[PDB]
């Protein structure tokens, strides 16, 4: 409903092409401080740390990275860097105290996306990949170690993103975007692919995110909310609940949305949905349909929102844009005191002791001019 | 050169402009007016919705400006309390020929009940040719007979100031000689970039200051009823005078001079020492040129501070460490309180209760648009609380 | 009549006369108290000037400007100490007094400096100028100590202050010795440079300089201040329009103040050189700091406009039907990757000679792409690229080989928004790389049937890799004495059944295989 103009930002030089899925942020050196991982098609992955313009480090794969990620895929309690190319290769990196990987294994080609999570509930983290031809494949790590294939699913509509959220039974799920503002639920890496629809062109590209926080300290185990975005410019937030989904809110914009992330800018535990368009019009919506629009006056190749360690060694919420002039912009003061717009008269009304503190003063807070005169006297004429 | 704390200002809204504005673009109204160079005028305000507020920026169309005319300056004021009315003045240039024709339009709806209606005022123009390039439309209030009269003042390309007084009988604004009412405003060499006329409340004296493109700054203590120059002082600085403001640090008057190539300075003890006690604000020339400036209370302490807006996108605030907390070796000084940053060069500001709470918002017009800044609501909410509880406790202790 | 004060100056005045006499005649006041009617007046002025010149030389300026040797140099060189009382008040007003009395050993000048930024930006230039015409002088800036009343000169803080200065230069090296100098011992023939500065008012007092060279120095100073004032067009149309005042202080409102004013040279090195400016910063020392950003602003748009026309000329050229490699790189950088597809190259054993098959595979797909309306992009004269220009934008394709896979990438560049996306996505549905690979493999399999590859192993590999079979292909394969051998041994044959579908049978040890893009009952009937 209101716009802002964030100011402080870090510009990082970055030359090369990339897919909207080859950028992420996470801890690779295992120090509770997030770095930025960017994977380009020329055969190089760059990790950015702190706020230096140059990359912190480079990783040399063999060809055409298509997805990158970080997580505990080897189930050793540590964090590792995973990179998948186009011909179905798979590279592992241990960046904890050039840069050839530590593990190589071939998988089916035509890779498009990535996800690392415990999908079943066995306590071991599995890897899920989506392909250009409506095929999804699950894997697991097994000590020898090696990647062992698992259930594999066929779909009809194009797959764009995979996510894991809590199901109605309190168990992890696996959801995949399906064109036409639809999505498919996969079933267990022990009829086979359930489909749901949420009217526009049936070939409209669609992206999905899931596992949205709802409180503080619930990050250990909790989900239930997921968001959908379409290229024609519609966004939706829904809740799994029990039988079918509940539509929490829907918004129609007039831009070409191509990304979907979650952040925490207010800092009150809840996570806000962050969307970006091709022309740079960023939307930030809380769970109460309080939109805040930012507009970087550029054209966007890729978008990424999350925690990042920029200055003074401390993780802060950040927005990340990739531009056509070989520049990555990191906006990091993006914390907001609030989402809506308000004033002192309304904010001071919420607190309860105000009406006692002013009734003891004889002034009945029924006349706004008297209240504002008293407040101006209190603030600007203390004596 | 180090901030003594955090900036308590949080951005509320931001309305983007298609084209840029100028330092005379900003004007009063609790509404705000911002005119673009290409004839675009926007009226900023806020609206209430239950337990929330919403910024509103609506476009206004003014009558007699052709589609090729370029707006140069705008000002506004209200008629003196004996009468009623809102007066707006726009000076533009009709680009007919290599050098355009300057024009002055004065909008004032004389019809009763619509003096303050800006929609009706938008088409009530009184076009007037100029024969000079206007620079700044200012307004002043003088004492004639026994009643106050608010008049216009306009710098011109000719090094002179032109007074435009209303004619009571025939309801029209006509030029009149300046030396009749403002004897200190004659015999100038450069064009007055900024002019300030400070009154002394309950006193027929006044303090006039002006700075021109040459750097020449002139201050005159002038009596009104006798229309004589009680005293006059002048200095010759380096750069064009972006701003001069007359303010009291607590007699005991002082001036603030904000140039474009020098740190902003404050001359103290005007009526007793003239222009010799020069306290310069430390490290205020490190952020390009000081375009705007403002003198108001930003810390809610009852004592003023100096706000300086620069072209390097900076919003410095300076605080006065007076001898009331005496440190004679350092007492009575200005130190950098805090500092903010922006995305575009800042061209103007106001200090106005846009929202309607009693707290003063700081509207900042920059190259790309208008930012509205509020005080940190959490910070202010508890400060009012503690001050109110202190007052209640001290009144219970006293009144018993 | 001569004063008795100069009793021992008899030789000295004999060297300042035969010196100041030879100007017209060819070959305070107390101490200096054929047209014959004016000849005496002419001859008296020469002696008076001689006495004055000797006074300065022998009684005013032999003084010092300001472990024992260390203080005997910093005092001599004026680096450490304080300026002598001579160069405080008497020297200036006496050298200037050498004007009313006719004397060709003293010059003068002036300047304006419409503002006083440029004093630092004039002093360095004057130092370089003096050193160029004469490296003998050494510039020392003896500013008056703030608040001090008189001679206090300690070798712009507090603005609106009429800063004093006594920029001085002297032949320090040629002490114990008083074509460069105009005069010589006819006596302390030493020269001196004094440049008094009073607020915004310059004043030169070059003394004993060469006449032509000294006048040149004064004129160069005049021109230098002229050029510095001309470098008030920051004041004119950078500072003024920084407030948004483009119409108020225009250009030309000085020899360097002409309608043809080279802005670039005067927002550069502060000197006289030996898009409209009036809206430059519209809707986008302090001289080289204020115009320097203007230069960057004016270059960042020239480069952008250089790129913008390159973006459009190719669009219009290709929309009707050997672009440089850098042009291709820029085109790819300005465009977004949208889709891609890759497929296996099974004939290579390693992915279980071959290059020629890959090139053959490369060509037959190129011909397919052209048949749906794609134009080959020729490589410029110092990996295949195809284009299809549309009103919505440009769609580009790339073909290349990495390892053992064939990859196709589809770029897009916008220029009714969905009128390009739908065009972009529709091409993706027509790539048909899988079906093309299917058909190419089956066709190449029929190039040994008709005449050391283990065809049985390759057939098993192909059957395992694509058990289903793409729906857009046309060829078909089925598993289960007019024969022909195959070096194990395999039997092959070929009958051209047209129930039209060329078919063949291959059998090896008894396993047999039958070998039979578009936008089977014959596969099984052949028994």
Swiss-Prot record, chain A:
Pfam families in alphabetical order = Itfg2
Placement of FG-GAP repeats on the sequence: 19-48, 110-139
Key words of the record:
Lysosome, Membrane, Phosphoprotein, Repeat
| Keyword Iron (UniProt) | no
Q: Where in the cell is it found?
A: Lysosome membrane
InterPro entries, per database record: Integrin_alpha_N, KICSTOR_ITFG2, WD40_repeat_dom_sf
Record carries keyword Phosphoprotein:
yes
Highest taxon, organism lineage:
Eukaryota
Q: Which Gene3D superfamilies match?
A: Integrin alpha, N-terminal
GO BP terms: namely: cellular response to amino acid starvation; cellular response to glucose starvation; germinal center B cell differentiation; negative regulation of TORC1 signaling; regulation of TOR signaling
| GO cellular component labels | cytosol; Golgi apparatus; intracellular membrane-bounded organelle; KICSTOR complex; lysosomal membrane; nucleoplasm
The family database entries (PANTHER family) matched by this protein are listed as: INTEGRIN ALPHA REPEAT DOMAIN-CONTAINING (PTHR16317), KICSTOR COMPLEX PROTEIN ITFG2 (PTHR16317:SF1)
Q: What does the record give as the function of this protein?
A: As part of the KICSTOR complex functions in the amino acid-sensing branch of the TORC1 signaling pathway. Recruits, in an amino acid-independent manner, the GATOR1 complex to the lysosomal membranes and allows its interaction with GATOR2 and the RAG GTPases. Functions upstream of the RAG GTPases and is required to negatively regulate mTORC1 signaling in absence of amino acids. In absence of the KICSTOR complex mTORC1 is constitutively localized to the lysosome and activated. The KICSTOR complex is also probably involved in the regulation of mTORC1 by glucose.
Query: Could you describe the subunit structure of this protein?
Result: Part of the KICSTOR complex composed of KPTN, ITFG2, KICS2 and SZT2. SZT2 probably serves as a link between the other three proteins in the KICSTOR complex and may mediate the direct interaction with the GATOR complex via GATOR1. The KICSTOR complex interacts directly with the GATOR1 complex and most probably indirectly with the GATOR2 complex in an amino acid-independent manner.
Q: What is this protein called?
A: KICSTOR complex protein ITFG2
The encoding gene is ITFG2
UniProtKB/Swiss-Prot annotation, chain B:
Segment forming the signal sequence: none
Q: Which domain of life is it from?
A: Eukaryota
GO terms, biological process: actin filament organization; cellular response to amino acid starvation; cellular response to glucose starvation; negative regulation of TORC1 signaling; protein localization to lysosome
Keyword annotations: Acetylation, Actin-binding, Cell projection, Disease variant, Intellectual disability, Lysosome, Membrane
The principal localisation class reads membrane
GO cellular component, as recorded? glutamatergic synapse; KICSTOR complex; lamellipodium; lysosomal membrane; postsynaptic actin cytoskeleton; stereocilium
Q: Where in the cell is it found?
A: Lysosome membrane; Cell projection, Lamellipodium; Cell projection, Stereocilium
Gene Ontology terms, MF aspect = actin filament binding
The disease tied to this protein in UniProt is: Intellectual developmental disorder, autosomal recessive 41: A disorder characterized by significantly below average general intellectual functioning associated with impairments in adaptive behavior and manifested during the developmental period. MRT41 most consistent features are global developmental delay, macrocephaly with frontal bossing, high levels of anxiety, and some features suggestive of a pervasive developmental disorder. Less common features include fifth finger clinodactyly, recurrent pneumonia, and hepatosplenomegaly.
Q: Which PANTHER family match?
A: KICSTOR COMPLEX PROTEIN KAPTIN
Subunit notes for this chain?
A: Part of the KICSTOR complex composed of KPTN, ITFG2, KICS2 and SZT2. SZT2 probably serves as a link between the other three proteins in the KICSTOR complex and mediates the direct interaction with the GATOR1 complex. May associate with F-actin filaments.
Output this protein's name. Answer: KICSTOR complex protein kaptin
Its gene name is KPTN
Swiss-Prot record, chain C:
Domain of life, per UniProt, equals: Eukaryota
**Where, per UniProt, does this protein localize?**
Lysosome membrane; Peroxisome
The record's disease note says: Developmental and epileptic encephalopathy 18: A severe autosomal recessive neurologic disorder characterized by lack of psychomotor development apparent from birth, dysmorphic facial features, early onset of refractory seizures, and thick corpus callosum and persistent cavum septum pellucidum on brain imaging.
Record's function text: As part of the KICSTOR complex functions in the amino acid-sensing branch of the TORC1 signaling pathway. Recruits, in an amino acid-independent manner, the GATOR1 complex to the lysosomal membranes and allows its interaction with GATOR2 and the RAG GTPases. Functions upstream of the RAG GTPases and is required to negatively regulate mTORC1 signaling in absence of amino acids. In absence of the KICSTOR complex mTORC1 is constitutively localized to the lysosome and activated. The KICSTOR complex is also probably involved in the regulation of mTORC1 by glucose.
Tissues in which the protein is found: Expressed in the brain, predominantly in the parietal and frontal cortex, as well as in dorsal root ganglia. Expressed in peripheral white blood cells.
Q: What is this protein called?
A: KICSTOR complex protein SZT2
Record note on quaternary structure: Part of the KICSTOR complex composed of KPTN, ITFG2, KICS2 and SZT2. SZT2 probably serves as a link between the other three proteins in the KICSTOR complex and mediates the direct interaction with the GATOR1 complex.
């Amino acid at each position: 409903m209101r716009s802002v103009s964030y100011v402080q930002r870090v510009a990082l030089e970055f030359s090369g092409s990339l897919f909207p899925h080859a950028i992420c942020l996470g801890d690779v050196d295992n120090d509770t401080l997030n770095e930025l991982v960017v994977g380009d098609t020329s055969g190089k992955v760059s990790v950015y740390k702190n706020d230096d313009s140059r990359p912190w480090l480079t990783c040399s794969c063999q060809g055409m990275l298509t997805c990158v990620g970080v997580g505990d895929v080897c189930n050793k309690g540590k964090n590792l860097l995973v990179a998948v190319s186009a011909e179905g290769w798979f590279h592992l990196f241990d960046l904890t105290p050039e840069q050839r990987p530590v593990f190589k294994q071939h998988i089916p080609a035509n890779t498009k996306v990535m996800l690392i999570s415990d999908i079943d509930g066995d306590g071991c983290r599995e890897l899920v990949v989506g392909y250009t031809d409506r095929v999804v494949r699950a894997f697991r790590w097994e000590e020898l170690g090696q990647l062992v294939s698992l259930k594999k699913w066929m779909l009809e509509g194009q797959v764009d993103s995979l996510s894991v959220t809590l199901g109605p039974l309190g168990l992890p799920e696996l959801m995949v975007s399906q064109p036409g503002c639809a999505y498919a639920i996969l079933l267990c890496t022990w009829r086979d692919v359930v489909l749901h629809q949420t009217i526009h062109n049936k070939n409209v590209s669609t992206h999905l995110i899931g596992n949205i926080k709802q409180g503080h300290g619930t990050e250990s185990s909790g989900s239930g909310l997921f968001a959908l975005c379409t290229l024609d410019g519609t966004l939706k937030l829904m809740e799994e609940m029990e039988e079918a989904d509940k539509l929490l809110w829907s918004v129609q914009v007039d831009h070409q949305l191509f990304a979907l992330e979650k952040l925490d800018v207010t800092g009150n535990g809840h996570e806000e949905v962050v969307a970006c368009a091709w022309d740079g019009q960023t939307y930030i919506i809380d769970h109460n349909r309080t939109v805040v629009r930012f507009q970087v006056d550029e054209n966007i190749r890729a978008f990424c929102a999350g925690l990042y360690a920029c200055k003074e060694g401390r993780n802060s919420p950040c927005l990340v844009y990739v531009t056509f002039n070989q520049k990555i912009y990191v906006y990091w003061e993006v914390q907001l005191e609030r989402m809506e717009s308000t004033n002192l008269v309304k904010l001071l009304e919420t607190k309860p002791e105000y009406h006692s503190l002013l009734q003891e003063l004889g002034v009945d807070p029924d006349d706004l001019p008297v209240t504002r005169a008293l407040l101006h006297q209190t603030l600007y004429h203390p004596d | 050169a180090v901030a003594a704390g955090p900036c308590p200002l949080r951005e509320d809204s931001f309305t983007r402009f298609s084209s840029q504005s100028n330092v005379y673009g900003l004007a009063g109204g609790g509404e705000l007016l911002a005119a673009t160079l290409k004839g675009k005028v926007l009226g900023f305000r806020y609206q209430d919705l239950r337990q929330k507020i919403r910024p509103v920026a609506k476009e206004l169309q003014f009558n007699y400006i052709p589609v090729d005319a370029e707006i140069v300056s705008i000002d506004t004021f209200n008629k003196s309390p004996p009468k009623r009315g809102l007066v707006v003045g726009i000076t533009f240039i009709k680009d007919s020929g290599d050098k355009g024709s300057p024009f002055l339009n004065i909008y004032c709806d004389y019809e009763p009940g619509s003096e303050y209606n800006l929609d009706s005022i938008a088409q009530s123009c009184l076009n007037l040719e100029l024969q000079f390039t206007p620079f700044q439309l200012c307004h002043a209030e003088v004492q004639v007979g026994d009643q106050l009269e608010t008049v216009f003042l306009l710098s011109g390309n000719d090094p002179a100031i032109h007074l435009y007084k209303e004619n009571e009988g025939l309801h029209q604004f006509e030029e009149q000689p300046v030396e009749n009412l403002f004897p200190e405003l004659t015999n100038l060499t450069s064009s007055v970039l900024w002019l300030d006329v400070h009154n002394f409340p309950g006193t027929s004296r006044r303090l006039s200051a002006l700075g021109c493109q040459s750097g020449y700054v002139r201050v005159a203590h002038v009596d009104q009823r006798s229309r004589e120059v009680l005293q006059m002082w002048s200095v010759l600085q380096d750069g064009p005078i972006s701003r001069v403001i007359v303010f009291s640090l607590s007699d005991e008057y002082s001036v603030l001079v904000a140039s474009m190539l020098e740190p902003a300075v404050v001359y103290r003890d005007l009526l007793n020492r003239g222009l010799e006690d020069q306290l310069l604000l430390p490290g205020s020339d490190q952020f390009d040129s000081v375009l705007c400036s403002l003198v108001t209370d930003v810390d809610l302490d009852g004592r003023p501070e100096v706000l300086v807006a620069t072209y390097g996108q900076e919003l410095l605030c300076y605080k006065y460490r007076g001898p009331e907390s005496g440190l004679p070796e350092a007492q009575h000084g200005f130190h950098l309180l805090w500092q903010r940053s922006f995305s575009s060069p800042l061209l103007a500001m106001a200090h106005v209760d846009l929202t309607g709470d009693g707290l003063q918002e700081l509207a900042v017009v920059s190259l790309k648009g208008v930012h509205i800044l509020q005080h940190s609501l959490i910070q202010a909410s508890e400060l009012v609380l503690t001050r109110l509880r202190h007052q209640v406790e001290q009144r219970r202790r006293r009144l018993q | 009549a001569l004063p008795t004060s100069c009793r021992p100056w008899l030789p000295a005045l004999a060297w300042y006369l035969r010196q100041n006499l030879l100007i017209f005649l060819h070959s305070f006041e107390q101490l200096t108290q054929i047209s014959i009617v004016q000849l005496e007046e002419k001859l008296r002025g020469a002696a008076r000037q001689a006495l004055a010149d000797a006074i300065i030389e022998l009684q005013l300026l032999p003084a010092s400007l300001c472990r024992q040797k260390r203080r005997t140099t910093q005092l001599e060189e004026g680096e450490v100490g304080t300026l002598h009382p001579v160069f405080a008040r008497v020297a200036q007003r006496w050298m200037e007094f050498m004007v009313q009395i006719g004397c060709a050993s003293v010059s003068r000048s002036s300047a304006h400096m419409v503002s006083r930024f440029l004093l630092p930006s004039i002093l360095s230039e004057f130092t370089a100028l003096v050193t160029s015409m004469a490296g003998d002088t050494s510039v020392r800036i003896f500013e008056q100590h703030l608040g001090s009343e008189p001679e206090i000169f300690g070798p712009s803080p507090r603005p609106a202050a009429e800063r004093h200065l006594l920029l001085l230069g002297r032949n320090f090296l040629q002490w114990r010795r008083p074509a460069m100098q105009r005069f010589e011992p006819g006596a302390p023939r030493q020269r001196l440079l004094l440049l008094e500065v009073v607020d915004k008012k310059l004043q030169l007092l070059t003394y004993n300089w060469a006449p032509d060279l000294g006048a040149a120095l004064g004129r160069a100073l005049v021109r230098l201040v002229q050029w510095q004032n001309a470098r008030a067009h920051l004041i004119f149309c950078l500072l003024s329009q920084k407030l948004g005042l483009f119409h108020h202080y225009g250009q030309l409102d000085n020899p360097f103040l002409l309608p043809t004013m080279e802005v670039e040279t005067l927002i550069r090195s502060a000197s006289p050189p030996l898009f409209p400016f009036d809206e430059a910063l519209r809707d986008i020392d302090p001289v080289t700091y204020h115009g320097q950003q203007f230069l960057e602003i004016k270059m960042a748009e020239r480069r952008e406009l250089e790129r913008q026309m390159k973006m459009e000329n190719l669009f219009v050229t290709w929309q009707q039907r050997p672009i440089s490699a850098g042009e291709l790189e820029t085109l790819k950088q300005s465009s977004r990757l949208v889709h891609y597809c890759a497929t296996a190259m099974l004939f290579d054993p390693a992915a279980w000679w071959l290059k020629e098959l890959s090139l053959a595979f490369l060509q037959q797909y190129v011909q397919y792409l052209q048949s749906i309306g794609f134009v080959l992009v020729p490589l410029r004269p110092p990996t295949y690229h195809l284009q299809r220009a549309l009103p919505g934008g440009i769609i580009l394709m790339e073909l290349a080989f990495q390892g053992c896979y064939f990859c196709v990438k589809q770029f897009a560049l916008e220029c009714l928004s969905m009128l390009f996306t739908e065009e972009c996505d529709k091409v993706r549905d027509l790539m048909h790389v899988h079906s093309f690979s299917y058909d190419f493999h089956l066709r190449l399999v029929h190039q040994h049937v008709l005449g050391g590859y283990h065809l049985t192993t390759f057939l098993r590999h192909f059957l395992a890799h694509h058990p289903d079979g793409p729906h857009f292909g046309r060829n078909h394969i089925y598993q289960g004495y007019h024969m022909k051998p195959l070096r194990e041994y395999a039997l092959v044959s070929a009958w051209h059944s047209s129930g039209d579908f060329d078919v063949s049978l291959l059998v090896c040890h008894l396993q047999f295989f039958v070998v039979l893009p578009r936008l089977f009952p014959p596969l099984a009937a052949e028994v």
